[PDB]
């Protein structure tokens, strides 16, 4: 994995030794080269994972998350270079250093063979994200946002640490490859009940679980654009990755420990999607849509069938691309009208038609239009939850109504109707902005041609 | 450019159902002042439109003539 | 004759 870790670290002298006019160009270029390099992780086998060393491995779960992570860094640099144009040069380099450091922590979060090293990289991701939100977020509430993001995580993750160390004392190892063969069944007891909660609640916070989700519509809203891109696209998926690894050790107790959380997710995706119908802040609407989409990934991981894991990893990759694009579109309107109020700037298709086409494609992927990988993940989770219980289709199908309703309402409010008369600073779309939208949307649509690389380890 | 409107004095409601309307209004002491404004709808080429069975039987005459010609044609062609 | 200017946003970019 060290052929990816070392160039990601070499981005640090690359950004700190660059000429002052070259720090976006150089980091964008070489992060795109690292992202091109990331496709060598697609040496996956039908039986074995790609096991590099004692410290690092990559199966078909971690590989698309790695490719998406390494792809998101150039797009974050493109998204962030405009609103940091007037910034001090050293603070600009510190911002890029926090993004590079976050990429470095993420790529060895997903490839960590041993679970306590997964824990340390998983929690190490908090510090650059907290710094990016509280230092380069725009408003006052970022400070409060930085507290919620910090303290819902750690209150969930410090019982995980203890739990993992307990497994270290019980199994003798936290190697996931060893734990594939030495896993013992976890019977019904109170000790194993709180073992289950300590193993699961940190990832439940990261997803987020409904009812634990309150950090997200502050953290993703108050963040700068690169912060929101990495929070929605990658850091939510640390929870899903960690659940898919940790539920190996939690059988068969999961078969009744999942029942409350499944309810919290199945009703929660009804709630948060409904919340999106009455959001006045566009970026808050995109955040609540992320909570609603990750509720399906929670249900799919908890019912733990092959179809549900395939749907959940497809939905994680698809939601990463779609939610990152939606935050970038909302930012492209924020960088013109300087307000996140969705009803403010209307009729934007009359003024910005190609950006309206990007809004259309991102809305269509948000509502899971076939054959997008959004629909592939959505549909496969719906198949597996119908097999779990046939009544879930009600809460599934009603969700797909509301998901359509808030996706097009967002599209109707901002793009359609009459333009606002008094707003006259709607600049034509920059090449950087359309480029950012296309670098989200074109890989997302090309993955429909060959979705087997985003279907995870039990494709 | 310039459009020449027809004369306004030619629009008289005599011979139209506006005449019947004015008679039934004058039977109770009333009078209709906007009749000549509506008079063009009942005059000229818009007067004497077909009925509904006259609308359905449009082209029935030539269709029946072609029918008789084709029936006689096949009746002579079979022999 | 009487061709009118159509106000539209910038399609250059």
């Amino acid at each position: 994995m060290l052929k990816y870790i070392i160039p990601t670290m070499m981005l640090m002298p690359l950004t700190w030794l660059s000429k002052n006019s070259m720090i976006w160009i150089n980091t964008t270029l070489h992060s795109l080269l690292i992202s091109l390099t990331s496709l060598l992780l697609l040496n996956q086998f039908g039986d074995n994972s790609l096991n590099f060393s004692l410290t690092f491995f990559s199966d078909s779960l971690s590989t698309p998350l790695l490719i998406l992570t390494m792809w998101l860094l150039p797009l974050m640099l493109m998204a962030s270079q405009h609103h940091l144009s007037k910034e001090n040069l050293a603070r600009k380099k510190l911002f890029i250093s926090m993004l590079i450091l976050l990429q470095l922590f993420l790529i060895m979060t997903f490839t960590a063979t041993e679970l306590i090293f997964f824990y340390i990289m998983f929690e190490a991701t908090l510090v650059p994200t907290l710094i990016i939100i509280t230092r380069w977020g725009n408003q006052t509430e970022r400070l409060n946002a930085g507290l919620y993001f910090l303290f819902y995580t750690l209150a969930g993750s410090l019982p995980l640490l203890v739990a993992l160390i307990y497994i270290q004392n019980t199994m003798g190892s936290l190697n996931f490859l060893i734990l594939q063969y030495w896993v013992q069944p976890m019977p019904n007891s109170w000790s194993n009940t709180f073992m289950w909660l300590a193993c699961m609640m940190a990832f439940m916070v990261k997803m987020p679980l409904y009812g634990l989700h309150l950090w997200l519509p502050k953290a993703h809203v108050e963040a700068p654009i690169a912060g929101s891109m990495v929070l929605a696209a990658i850091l939510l998926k640390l929870g899903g990755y960690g659940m898919m690894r940790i539920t190996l050790l939690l059988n068969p107790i999961t078969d009744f420990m999942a029942y409350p959380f499944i309810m919290l997710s199945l009703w929660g995706m009804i709630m948060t999607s409904s919340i999106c119908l009455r959001q006045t802040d566009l970026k808050s609407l995109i955040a609540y849509s992320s909570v609603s989409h990750m509720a399906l990934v929670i249900v799919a991981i908890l019912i733990q069938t092959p179809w549900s894991y395939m749907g959940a990893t497809a939905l994680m990759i698809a939601h990463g691309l779609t939610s990152s694009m939606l935050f970038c579109l909302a930012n492209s309107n924020y960088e013109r009208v300087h307000s996140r109020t969705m009803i403010l700037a209307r009729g934007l298709q009359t003024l910005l038609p190609l950006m309206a086409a990007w809004w259309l494609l991102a809305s269509l992927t948000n509502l899971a239009l076939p054959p997008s990988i959004n629909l592939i993940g959505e549909l496969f989770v719906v198949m597996s939850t119908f097999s779990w219980s046939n009544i879930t289709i009600i809460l599934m199908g009603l969700n797909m109504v509301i998901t359509a309703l808030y996706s097009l309402y967002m599209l109707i409010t901002t793009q359609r109707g009459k333009h606002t008369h008094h707003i006259n600073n709607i600049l034509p779309s920059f090449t950087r902005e359309n480029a950012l939208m296309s670098l989200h949307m074109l890989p997302l649509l090309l993955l429909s041609l060959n979705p087997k690389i985003i279907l995870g380890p039990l494709y | 450019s310039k459009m020449e409107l027809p004369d306004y004095k030619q629009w008289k409601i005599e011979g139209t159902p506006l005449e019947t309307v004015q008679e039934k209004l004058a039977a109770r002491g009333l009078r209709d002042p906007w009749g000549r404004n509506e008079a063009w709808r009942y005059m000229g080429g818009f007067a004497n439109n077909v009925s509904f069975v006259g609308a359905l039987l449009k082209g029935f005459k030539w269709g029946f003539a072609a029918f008789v010609v084709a029936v006689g044609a096949e009746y002579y062609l079979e022999s | 004759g009487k061709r009118l200017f159509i106000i539209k946003p910038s399609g250059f970019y």
């Binding site: - | - | 009487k2 061709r3 009118l4 200017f5």
Partner: protein
């Protein structure tokens, strides 16, 4: 009662400015100043080259794989002769005639 004289005067002045604005939307005869810039090609490029490409694809890549083009077997009647065998299908039993 209609307009006040201030309303009449304001509408007259706005009317004159509006008609000047609408007159100023007409183009010049030189405008738009533009920068300086095979009878059955449709049946060749949109029909015949696609029939070539699709027949190549179906003949040498699709039908070389099993069960990709599965055709319903042809309907056999009494009295038919099979091309692959030559075996004449015998006709039906004689009808108990009804009319």
């Amino acid at each position: 009662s209609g307009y006040t004289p201030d309303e009449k005067l304001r509408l007259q002045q706005l009317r004159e400015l509006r008609r000047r604005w609408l007159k100023d939307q007409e183009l010049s005869p030189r405008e738009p100043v533009l920068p300086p810039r095979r009878h059955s090609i449709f049946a060749f490029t949109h029909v015949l080259i696609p029939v070539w490409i699709i027949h190549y694809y179906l003949k040498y890549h699709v039908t070389t794989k099993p069960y990709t083009i599965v055709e319903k077997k042809p309907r056999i009647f009494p009295g038919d002769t099979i091309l692959e065998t030559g075996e004449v299908i015998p006709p039906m039993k004689e009808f108990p005639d009804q009319h």
